[PDB]
Design an enzyme around this catalytic site. Structure first.
Site, PDB file in Angstrom:
ATOM      1  N   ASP A  74       0.881  -1.192   0.000  1.00  0.00           N
ATOM      2  CA  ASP A  74       0.000   0.000   0.000  1.00  0.00           C
ATOM      3  C   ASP A  74       0.900   1.218   0.000  1.00  0.00           C
ATOM      4  O   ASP A  74       1.696   1.348   0.924  1.00  0.00           O
ATOM      5  CB  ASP A  74      -0.872   0.090   1.248  1.00  0.00           C
ATOM      6  N   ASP A  76       0.956   5.573  -0.329  1.00  0.00           N
ATOM      7  CA  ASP A  76       0.040   6.721  -0.149  1.00  0.00           C
ATOM      8  C   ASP A  76       0.756   7.992  -0.596  1.00  0.00           C
ATOM      9  O   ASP A  76       1.860   8.224  -0.117  1.00  0.00           O
ATOM     10  CB  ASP A  76      -0.417   6.850   1.303  1.00  0.00           C
ATOM     11  N   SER A  90       3.542   0.599   2.894  1.00  0.00           N
ATOM     12  CA  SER A  90       3.336  -0.551   3.801  1.00  0.00           C
ATOM     13  C   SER A  90       3.623  -1.842   3.041  1.00  0.00           C
ATOM     14  O   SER A  90       2.929  -2.111   2.060  1.00  0.00           O
ATOM     15  CB  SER A  90       1.937  -0.529   4.325  1.00  0.00           C
ATOM     16  N   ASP A 201     -12.345  -4.090   0.358  1.00  0.00           N
ATOM     17  CA  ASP A 201     -11.130  -4.163   1.203  1.00  0.00           C
ATOM     18  C   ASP A 201     -11.550  -4.051   2.656  1.00  0.00           C
ATOM     19  O   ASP A 201     -11.951  -2.968   3.067  1.00  0.00           O
ATOM     20  CB  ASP A 201     -10.160  -3.032   0.888  1.00  0.00           C
ATOM     21  N   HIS A 203     -10.014  -3.931   6.048  1.00  0.00           N
ATOM     22  CA  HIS A 203      -8.775  -3.799   6.847  1.00  0.00           C
ATOM     23  C   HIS A 203      -9.125  -3.988   8.318  1.00  0.00           C
ATOM     24  O   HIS A 203      -9.611  -3.035   8.924  1.00  0.00           O
ATOM     25  CB  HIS A 203      -8.224  -2.387   6.696  1.00  0.00           C
TER      26      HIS A 203
END
Length: 265
Positions: A74, A76, A90, A201, A203
């Site tokens: 991931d 950002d 990540s 998704d 999480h």
């Protein structure tokens, strides 16, 4: 009318691919969860029926045989002063494609059904589903007035990610076929601009659920087959398929290298 011109081919092969989940501000990518998988065992079954000289019906299907580990990242792009530079990243090595499947009913219009060379306008419906699970991992985050400072790993058991993708695609295309001696080469192309795509998704961080549902998305598939007739009543074939679902949104790229036996019944 040829009611006994039926076919059956079980195949075995490998699916390598990538899934891109992107988070946006309603449109700018502020996050991208890039899931990756390589050489996952799959099995592919298929039926075909040439009841009419220039018209043919068929039904395919493939499923993963078991899970296959992969990787997810991931990123950002929170820095505004430097747009294309990632701010936080990540790494998730314990990513694993749990399952992947597909079903495809199709109808082909044979412009040519000459025994040595066939060409058909194709049309049909395919439904592909994909599922992944990640668990813990590394982090290269950036503090407020810093950059790439924080550098640790999430204590496992305090982090889990689950991603699913569902694409319902009605498509049109072209199936080709040519026969030199006892060998059969050929290939296909499929297109849809009417793909209903879905993502989810979850999480779980002791859960945030991000889901998108785009309509009328796109689908491009190119296939290339090469076979040989061991018996006049059986053909062993190998096939490579390259697929892409896009427009960005719920994106998927797949490469399925398969090989199997077609017992023309």
């Amino acid at each position: 009318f040829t009611p006994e011109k039926i076919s059956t081919e079980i195949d075995f092969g490998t699916l390598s691919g990538k899934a891109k989940e992107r988070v946006y501000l309603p449109g700018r990518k502020a996050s991208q969860l890039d899931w990756k998988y390589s050489n996952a065992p799959i099995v592919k079954g298929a039926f075909n029926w040439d009841l009419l000289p220039r018209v043919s019906v068929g039904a395919s299907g493939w499923t993963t045989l078991a899970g296959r580990g992969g990787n997810m990242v991931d990123r950002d792009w929170l820095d505004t002063s430097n747009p294309g530079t990632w701010t936080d990243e990540s790494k998730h090595p314990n990513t694993r494609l749990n399952f992947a499947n597909e079903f495809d009913l199709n109808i082909k219009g044979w412009l040519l059904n000459q025994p040595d060379y066939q060409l058909g306008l194709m049309a049909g419906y395919q439904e592909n589903r994909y599922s992944f699970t990640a668990k813990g991992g590394s982090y290269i985050y950036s503090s407020e007035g810093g950059f790439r400072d924080e550098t640790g790993s999430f204590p496992d058991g305090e982090r889990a990610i689950g991603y699913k993708q569902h694409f319902k695609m009605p498509y049109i295309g072209l199936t080709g076929n040519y026969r030199y001696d006892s060998f059969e080469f050929g290939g296909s192309f499929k297109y849809s601009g009417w793909v209903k795509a879905s993502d989810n998704d979850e999480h779980y961080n002791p859960r945030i659920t991000y889901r998108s549902d785009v309509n009328n998305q796109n689908y491009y598939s190119v296939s290339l087959h090469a076979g040989y007739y061991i018996t006049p009543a059986a053909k062993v074939y190998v096939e490579g398929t390259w697929n892409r679902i896009t427009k960005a949104g719920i994106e998927s790229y797949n490469f399925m290298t398969t090989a199997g036996l077609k017992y023309y019944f």
